[PDB]
Design a protein around this ligand. Structure first.
Ligand SMILES: Cc1cn(-c2cc(NC(=O)c3ccc(C)c(Nc4nc(-c5cccnc5)nc5c4cnn5C)c3)cc(C(F)(F)F)c2)cn1
Length: 269
């Protein structure tokens, strides 16, 4: 059902991270570069179910803005999940290393792509639960692909998911709003140094993240509506994609900027 790759076609080269019960590698597939997640000897029944379940769901997704599965090794050990390789890595680190290097139109384009991937997931009845810039990969065309590397992300999570574990595509919309703020700030840490409890207290008291610098008014308005306490009031991903698409296609719309609240005053004559 899911494309099975023979192990002789896979060459693991470099460790790039860790999995639930295995490592993640960069490698080559027979040669196309790939990323490879392994499940190592001793894995439990639950871990096998979760691993092959992940491969199965990934193999069903076919969208420009969702990481693409090349295939799986399930008939030999170690088992492996093999995806396309994204040369620019994770979005959060990418933007922190490229501060100021992109145009507003490029940044908004990345958000449209993320939103289109999320619309697809939500429509497929897949709730992500961990949407954050650390879980988005960037290719050499600046295309953002929603992914999930595994883990608690209080600062990205909607109030109802924190409070009573209600994870839905509307809590993913909240998280998307946070991602919008991450992108427009080049990977600033949401809420800066506030502790997790201080973040939750602030949200419940009605505070929201302030405008990024150089942020189109329309983009700030959209992120703010993703952060409505009442789940039913938030936009759906279809609404988000539509808005972002219309802003990009009429790019003068992005020239009107929201006011940035200075945290520091410098007086010169
Ligand atoms: C039932 C269910 C469904 N899912 C679920 C799981 C996934 N899984 C992944 O995204 C995934 C899995 C394996 C690999 C090999 C990769 N590829 C990469 N991984 C890493 C990497 C780095 C450090 C640590 N870990 C990984 N770096 C990479 C690549 C490619 N380039 N680079 C630089 C991604 C995705 C979604 C989705 F699409 F919905 F978001 C859902 C969970 N449970």
């Amino acid at each position: 059902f899911t494309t099975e790759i023979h192990p002789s076609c896979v060459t693991r080269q470099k460790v790039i991270g860790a999995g639930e019960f295995g490592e993640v590698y960069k490698g080559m597939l027979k040669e196309v570069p790939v990323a490879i997640k392994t499940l190592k000897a001793g894995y439990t029944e639950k871990q096998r179910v979760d691993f092959l379940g992940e491969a199965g769901i990934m193999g069903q997704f076919s969208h420009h803005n969702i990481i693409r599965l090349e295939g799986v090794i399930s008939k030999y050990k170690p088992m492996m999940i093999i995806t396309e390789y994204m040369e620019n890595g994770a979005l959060d680190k990418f933007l922190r290393e490229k501060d100021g290097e992109f145009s507003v139109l490029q940044l908004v384009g990345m958000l449209r792509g993320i939103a289109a991937g999320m619309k697809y997931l939500a429509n497929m009845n897949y709730v992500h639960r961990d949407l954050a810039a650390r879980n988005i990969l960037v290719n050499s065309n600046l295309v953002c692909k929603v992914s999930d590397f595994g883990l608690i992300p209080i600062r990205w999570t909607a109030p109802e998911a924190i409070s009573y574990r209600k994870f839905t595509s509307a809590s993913d919309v909240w998280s998307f709003g946070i991602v919008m703020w991450e992108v427009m700030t080049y990977g600033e840490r949401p809420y800066w140094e506030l502790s997790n409890h201080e973040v939750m207290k602030a949200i419940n008291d009605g505070f929201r993240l302030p405008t990024p610098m150089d942020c189109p008014s329309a983009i700030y308005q959209l992120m703010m509506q993703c952060w409505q306490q009442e789940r039913a009031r938030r936009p759906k991903f279809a609404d988000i994609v539509s808005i972002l698409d219309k802003l990009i296609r009429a790019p003068d719309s992005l020239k009107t900027l929201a006011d940035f609240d200075p945290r520091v005053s410098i007086r010169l004559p």
